[PDB]
Amino acid sequence: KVFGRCELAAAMKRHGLDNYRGYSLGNWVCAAKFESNFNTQATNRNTDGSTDYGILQINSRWWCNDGRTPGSRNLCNIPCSALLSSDITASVNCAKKIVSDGNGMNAWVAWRNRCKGTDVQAWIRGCRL
Ligand code: NA
């Protein structure tokens, strides 16, 4: 599923991401834009041999099991393919754990490099308040 921007904002809000660990909703929409281009099916193999999965590009070395990543810890206790669903629930539940770790949203490289320090409110322009 390729989400509309405001559609994803609504879905993320429904799941309580707005202001989760202090990160306003625009941060989460911005992250998803630059991590997956709002595409739940997005997968990207990493140089390290892990793969990033879904709307928020959750990694197979630490967070989910994809059956092919050496050193997999599976801290979210989920198959990585579950993170590709049109239903973002599993991705959100795992993101909540991820963002609760020491570095916060800095774990998402696209957030750190493209969203952090910018006017992230722009990413929810037009979306129901
Ligand atoms: Na992999």
UniProtKB/Swiss-Prot annotation:
EC number(s) on file: 3.2.1.17
Domain C-type lysozyme stretches: 1-129
GO molecular-function terms, A-Z: beta-N-acetylglucosaminidase activity; identical protein binding; lysozyme activity
Catalytic activity: Hydrolysis of (1->4)-beta-linkages between N-acetylmuramic acid and N-acetyl-D-glucosamine residues in a peptidoglycan and between N-acetyl-D-glucosamine residues in chitodextrins
Cellular compartments annotated: Secreted
SMART domains (UniProt xref): LYZ1
Keyword Signal among UniProt keywords: yes
Gene Ontology biological process: cell wall macromolecule catabolic process; defense response to bacterium; defense response to Gram-negative bacterium; defense response to Gram-positive bacterium; killing of cells of another organism
Residues engaged in binding substrate: 101
CDD domains the UniProt entry points to: LYZ_C (cd16897)
Disulfide bonding pattern of the chain: 6-127, 30-115, 64-80, 76-94
InterPro entries membership: Glyco_hydro_22, Glyco_hydro_22_CS, Glyco_hydro_22_lys, Lysozyme-like_dom_sf
Expressing tissues: In the egg white and polymorphonuclear leukocytes.
Active site: 35, 52
Similarity comment text for this entry: Belongs to the glycosyl hydrolase 22 family.
Misc note: Lysozyme C is capable of both hydrolysis and transglycosylation; it also shows a slight esterase activity. It acts rapidly on both peptide-substituted and unsubstituted peptidoglycan, and slowly on chitin oligosaccharides.
Function field: Lysozymes have primarily a bacteriolytic function; those in tissues and body fluids are associated with the monocyte-macrophage system and enhance the activity of immunoagents. Has bacteriolytic activity against M.luteus.
Protein's name according to its UniProt entry: Lysozyme C
Chain's gene name: LYZ
